Design a protein around this ligand. Structure first.
Ligand code: DJJ
Ligand code: DC
Ligand code: CL
Ligand code: CL
Ligand code: CL
Ligand code: MG
Ligand code: MG
Ligand code: NA
Ligand code: NA
Ligand code: NA
Length: 326
DNA sequence: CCGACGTCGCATCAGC
DNA sequence: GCTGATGCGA
DNA sequence: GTCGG
């Protein structure tokens, strides 16, 4: 990491703006600049050099100059001193506690892990599970464990219905040596953009994974998206593995390529690519790519028979999953 | 100088 | 209940 | 906070 000091600074500023300021566009701007700087293949020597990169403007350039000269950023040194900002930033590290809930908890005197555990009463279901596994959810998953988890998920899915196809996406599909959680794209021929011919398609996979004690908790669940918790089995006398976040997304089978493009990410890559689509006159979601008429209303879905077809429409050279870790 | 910034699923709540 | 908005998340 | 028209 040539520029890790700068990128950490911008990331901390991004998180400040999201959690404390509740300024989602500043959050995205800071993360976009951190990402372009992270892939820049030179050790940055000045703010002016960084300002050449798209997403780095005047203000970030000045912060880079202060950071290069001093090793620090006074704006951040002060944010770290604000008790309210410290409290809010801590509380939002619990899954299910966002910017608004964190600020309300602080108002109510609930500011520390101690306070949260004393007040499970005041937590919704999601937050209660985020608190239960607070430590575990900050541990990363070695790719070796991702492979064991993939084996279980793919085999249990096959036992329910051999026509399911489960694909592990996220950073795993991008070839990362570790991942923050497990993301699973699911398809079944009974669920297409034209009809849903079988109910409970997601539910049946979730129940089977619960049956074998792989899924341990549910954060939210609907007809096409599961957000929950899972755990690898341990051997005799072994310490248990940490509990891990798992997301399962059921996507219409004929829309698999848009779905796997979405779920492979990264999230910044998707934002960048979707914004480029818009400048090229297209809109992309996890289901389709459609043209945008001058009216601004999306037209009919365009034929897609590969991930690369999506890149072709917007005049981008193809980028393998490994090259999408923005 | 300023409007737009990616797109959408599930949980929650307010008004009717 | 339904609908629409907001929060939080992918 | 940055960018493009
Ligand atoms: N705001 C977002 C968040 C996620 N996503 C997509 C892209 C992302 O790759 C996918 C899974 O989300 P996750 O937060 O798990 O991101 P990952 O790419 O898997 C890595 Cl941050 P990690 O989960 O391995 O740490 O969902 C998105 O489009 N927009
Ligand atoms: N989860 C998945 C994965 C692949 N597929 C289909 C889409 C393609 O037509 C086909 C090609 O397989 P693969 O992409 O794994 O090479 O598999 C699916 O329907 N659901
Ligand atoms: Cl903002
Ligand atoms: Cl600092
Ligand atoms: Cl669509
Ligand atoms: Mg992930
Ligand atoms: Mg723009
Ligand atoms: Na720039
Ligand atoms: Na949180
Ligand atoms: Na995830």
């Amino acid at each position: 990491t040539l520029n890790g000091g700068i990128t950490d600074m911008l990331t901390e500023l991004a998180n400040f703006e999201k959690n404390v300021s509740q300024a989602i566009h500043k959050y995205n701007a800071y993360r976009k600049a951190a990402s372009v700087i992270a892939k820049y293949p030179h050790k940055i020597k000045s703010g002016a050099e960084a300002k050449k990169l798209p997403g780095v403007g005047t203000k970030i350039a000045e912060k880079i100059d202060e950071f290069l000269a001093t090793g620090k950023l006074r704006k951040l040194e002060k944010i770290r001193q604000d008790d309210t900002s410290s409290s809010i930033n801590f509380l939002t590290r619990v899954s299910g506690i966002g910017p608004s809930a964190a600020r309300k908890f602080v108002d109510e005197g609930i500011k520390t892990l101690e306070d949260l555990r004393k007040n499970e009463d005041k937590l919704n279901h999601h937050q209660r599970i985020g608190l239960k596994y607070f430590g575990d959810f900050e541990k990363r998953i070695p790719r070796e464990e991702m492979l064991q988890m993939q084996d279980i998920v793919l085999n249990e899915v096959k036992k329910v219905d051999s026509e399911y196809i489960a694909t592990v996406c996220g950073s795993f599909r991008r070839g990362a040596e570790s991942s923050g959680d497990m993301d699973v794209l699911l398809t079944h021929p009974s669920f297409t953009s034209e009809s849903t011919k079988q109910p409970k398609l997601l539910h049946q996979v979730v129940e089977q994974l619960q049956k074998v004690h792989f899924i341990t908790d549910t954060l939210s669940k609907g007809e096409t998206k599961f957000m929950g918790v899972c755990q690898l089995p341990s051997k005799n006398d072994e310490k248990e593995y940490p509990h891990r976040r798992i997301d399962i997304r059921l996507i219409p089978k004929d829309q698999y390529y848009c779905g796997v493009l979405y779920f492979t990410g990264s999230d910044i890559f998707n934002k960048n690519m979707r914004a480029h689509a818009l400048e090229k006159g297209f809109t992309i979601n996890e289901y389709t790519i459609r043209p945008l008429g001058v009216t601004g209303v999306a037209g009919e879905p365009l034929p897609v028979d590969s991930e690369k077809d999506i890149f072709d429409y917007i005049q981008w050279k193809y980028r393998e999953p490994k090259d999408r870790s923005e």
